[model samples]
Target: ERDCRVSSFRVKENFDKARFSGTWYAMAKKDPEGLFLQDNIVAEFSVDETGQMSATAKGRVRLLNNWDVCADMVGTFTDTEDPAKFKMKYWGVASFLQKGNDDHWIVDTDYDTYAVQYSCRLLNLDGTCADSYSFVFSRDPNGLPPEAQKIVRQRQEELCLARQYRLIVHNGYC
Candidate 1:
């Protein structure tokens, strides 16, 4: 089988993890097929003693028939060939739920303000993607900074995602 080579585009050139490690708010996102991490999204990034990146994500994962349940899930990341990409394995707190690995890519960021991340799961036979999700994370809980928003919008265009990304809201529930 030939490599489809759907590589990362518009990725950060010199990806710096030091500055990227911090609290991030998912200002906007285009979720994948099965919407797990729904709204009020927040993630904290940090570097461990072994110099590996780790993240803790908490958000409203729609449970039952209605959207009344939310879980505070945690995730760990594994490095990839690309510095901006990783493999994330996440699970719910002390439960057998919501644990999986997926492609995590930092498509674009300024290390301080905002980041554009893309992930596609379950490749199809004709080289099409089955499920895809992208996030626009910002350091500010209110919104993305002016300059960073401009840069992220351009990166979103390059990825060919939807122009109307649903803005994530934080209600202090989780």
Candidate 2:
């Protein structure tokens, strides 16, 4: 039986930041409340000499009515006891853009082909996630192979967000 409790969720074990550094395309996503990124989302992960991880992302975001722009955002990950969990402080290059702190978790990753990233912004009293977002990332922008896709699907289900995801299109809008 699967546990739906947020605290019971399993994350990637022995997650290596060095292996995870590079480009990853957001192939699919389960958006949180007040969704931000619209499409053409791409992220670059990097690890500094100190072994600290950081990321920069660009995506098309609709700021207001009919005003869509490529949002340049940056995020720094602060390590936790768990290797796969971190506190992410993110912000946009433009001052007026979105900024916040969130839980960044690497639920699963092959470190070569695909990755399942999750974040629960809010947890309910019932031990489930009240507000959460997840991303299925692929090393290739085109998409994951059939084998990888199957694995990602299983990981999505484990997060209890399989039915919520929608593919994120990459048409160079950003």
Candidate 3:
């Protein structure tokens, strides 16, 4: 009963960048094709006085065998016609890291508790996402309320990624 087309998905209505600024812990994630951000993923979001939104995400990534390093990535959003969607240009703070542009969509968020963020790196010919990544974020590092969990679950299903997510561990790795 759910539409899997990327364009048909609903995003957060009237998404406010100011209210969303702050820290958020990644509780779970659906990884994209060349997996990044293995674990201990945390992001700091902000909106400048000029109303441009950006984010700095920190996570542990394994670049080589037995070479796990903390990655500091920055992303700046370019607004589109929709308030909830934007084009995100992201790159690592260090010159050696990865860089690319992706579609950033605020699938859902309550601002105070939890947020569901989605990004499609590539789209299929059928109007579905070919390669995508999603993060389930919580304001509290411990966890989300049951109510918030329920809401997140529904959104997960709506994205047709309910079973693809894996729990993100936070053990002070970074």
Candidate 4:
């Protein structure tokens, strides 16, 4: 069987225009913990008149009590055999050399249930590091069932193991 680990996820369903039109919070993160705090984060994604996917995400550090901190990125989705699998590029604000990059692969999805699992690669502009990330999201925070959570976690674990393969062959360390 082809390894699902590190494999680019194919969107298995079509993008739901309605379900994606609201705010989403960051429940958790993989590496670099403690950067984003508060469940108050929100993201809005929509399709523009030009038929391109556009998004805006905003969040603040609760302890700092300042909303001045924010991040903005833009991306588009291309239709594939599976309408749900879309390639995405999230780039940081257009400023002076301060950019965060991410490539997303939509592995599985269920629009009616408002659920999706995606794998991503975060690029470090400074060339010092790169990390793999995965997320399982739903339109409603409580929408995830126990079985679904188990499946998502399993997929993440599989991906983590695959990272070891790369270290052994290319980076020469694990």
- Report residue 67 deviation for candidate 1 (angstroms): 5.0
Identify the runs in model 4 with alpha carbons over 4 angstroms from their true place.
1-5, 8-20, 32-39, 61-68, 72-97, 112-114, 117-119, 122-130, 161-174
Off by over 4 Å in 1: 1-5, 65-67, 94-96
Backbone atom clashes (below 3 Å) for every candidate:
0, 0, 0, 3
Q: Return the TM-score for each candidate structure.
A: 0.88, 0.95, 0.96, 0.53
Q: How far is candidate 3 from the true structure (C-alpha RMSD, Å)?
A: 1.2
Better of 2 and 3 by lDDT: 3
Model 1, C-alpha of 72: deviation from truth (Å): 1.8
Scored by lDDT, the top model is 3
TM-score preference between candidates 1 and 3, better one: 3
lDDT, each prediction: 0.78, 0.91, 0.93, 0.45
- For residues 1-174, what per-residue lDDT tens digits would candidate 2 score against the true structure? 568898998899999999999999998999999957878999999999999999998888786677878888999999999999999999999633678999999999998999999999998898899999999999998778898989888999999998899999898766
Cα error, candidate 1, residue 25 (Å): 0.3
* Cα-based lDDT at residue 2, candidate 3: 57
Expressed as tens digits, the lDDT of each residue in 1-174 for candidate 1 is 433334535567767777789898998988788656778888888988886888888777666767666667777878877788788887787332657888888889887788988888867776556678888998888887678878887877777675847888789876
With a 3 Å backbone cut-off (N, CA, C), the pairs that clash in candidate 4 are 11-84, 11-85, 13-84
Q: How displaced is residue 138 in candidate 2, in Å?
A: 0.4
Q: Write the per-residue lDDT of candidate 4 for residues 44-128, one digit (tens) a residue.
A: 6677676565566544333456543334445555544454545565555533123444444544445433333344454356432
